A paper describes a structure:
GRKs chiefly function to initiate the deactivation of agonist occupied GPCRs primarily through phosphorylation of their cytoplasmic C-terminal tails, which leads to the recruitment of arrestins and ultimately clathrin-mediated endocytosis. Individual GRKs are validated targets for the treatment of human conditions ranging from heart failure to diabetes. Although GRK2 has thus far been the primary focus of drug discovery efforts, GRK5 has been increasingly targeted as a potential treatment for cardiac hypertrophy. The development of inhibitors selective for GRK5 over GRK2 has been challenging due to high sequence identity in their active sites.
Author numbering: 28 to 481, 491 to 533
Write the structure that this text describes.
Amino acid sequence: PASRDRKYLARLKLPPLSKCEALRESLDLGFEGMCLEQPIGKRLFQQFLRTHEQHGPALQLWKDIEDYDTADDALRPQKAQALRAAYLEPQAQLFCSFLDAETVARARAGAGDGLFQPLLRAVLAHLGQAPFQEFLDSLYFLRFLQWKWLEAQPMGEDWFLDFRVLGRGGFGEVFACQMKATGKLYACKKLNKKRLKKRKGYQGAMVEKKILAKVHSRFIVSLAYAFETKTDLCLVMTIMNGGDIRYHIYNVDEDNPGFQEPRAIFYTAQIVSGLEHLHQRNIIYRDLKPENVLLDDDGNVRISDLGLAVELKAGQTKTKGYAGTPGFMAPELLLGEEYDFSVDYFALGVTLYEMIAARGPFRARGEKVENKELKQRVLEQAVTYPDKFSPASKDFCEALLQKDPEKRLGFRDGSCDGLRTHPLFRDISWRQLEAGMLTPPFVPDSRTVYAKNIKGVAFEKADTEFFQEFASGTCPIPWQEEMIETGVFGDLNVWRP
Ligand SMILES: CC(C)c1ccc2oc3nc(N)c(C(=O)O)cc3c(=O)c2c1
Ligand SMILES: [Cl-]
């Protein structure tokens, strides 16, 4: 697919303003939701602030804090100094007068990791008041509505060209496809309708869809579009051309398999960030393993396949249910007891162990064991560590592979902050990692392909009613990201050529 389609790009055209009146009422106009969380909203909000002299200081301070948050440690002292001199001095041209004396004085002191975070909250609080109100009453808000109208237009199977098959497995096939208008590459997972019904796979598919839709993280595969065809239910999501971790452990360098420790730590840190994102939203992954951790072109990883994931309702702290992969399921799960997010951290310990050791903690390399035998080992067998493990790796895996979930390291006080402070992540800049700034340790070769692999019922009302609910359409944030990434936003959002 060495070519976008101009026929479908032509369909991406901004509507007249009258077509956006209906949308203006039936839409969440929250400041946080519109101008911070939605890329096009933020972009248009900042353009508004740019073009209004009085909001210049607040805009540039906002940008410089974000600049400081992603900068190299060597440049941070300088950028902190320049920032304070530019915005936090009464006589400075871009002095932010809207701040309190308390916040300005505070920001002028200290040089910590979380510096300017109180300052950012103060700026965003200010911007969400008067400047936001002015924005709603400006052309830039109307332009946002135009983009939102375009976002809501139908973009089903006709907008996607499948050009290669990636996998064939449980419940359907996975294709690599191109969004025709913009040319962006996606992975499309197609679930066969008849097969789903036959396996009663409605809950598992619906739950996965809803989770992928509501979650937005660089360490979890994103859902961009959800639509239906005559035969399939389709999920268009982030493509990951590097393939799964497991392949990279064993099938590159087969004479010395396993990752170098720095590389294993990098992926672990990325996985942790993904897990935290789910756990902070009361979701349990329940299927963490090398084969479900995928690599993209740049060498960054994401967790995938949320089919066994479960969301706790409000008030609920633990759940019950046998689900997962043999060798990665925690003891408390295997015993049929209640469990929380701790099960995912046990799986992380196993995942990290396998990355370094090039084998499971409970089996030798290539050993085939029956599920009853492997169940006994997880519950009873103590994990041994070969010489490739450093003191940090061993200690960390020992902490994660605790059979008792009370003694096990993981989610505490609404975060993984306690886990981050382990000496294993000594050389990891969490701040840059989470912003996707860190250079990955290994970059996959685009030439190289990192993989192996190769009834009649009628539909009722409840089936079609379910499929429409499933086919929720375009996911707002991933779509906006796409419009910007591909330059379609820049191209259509002009004023004077
Ligand atoms: C055939 C192999 C080299 C390959 C290349 C790209 C891939 O891109 C993917 N993207 C996804 N979102 C998911 C997923 O959502 O599970 C899975 C894959 C692959 O398996 C996958 C496998
Ligand atoms: Cl205006």
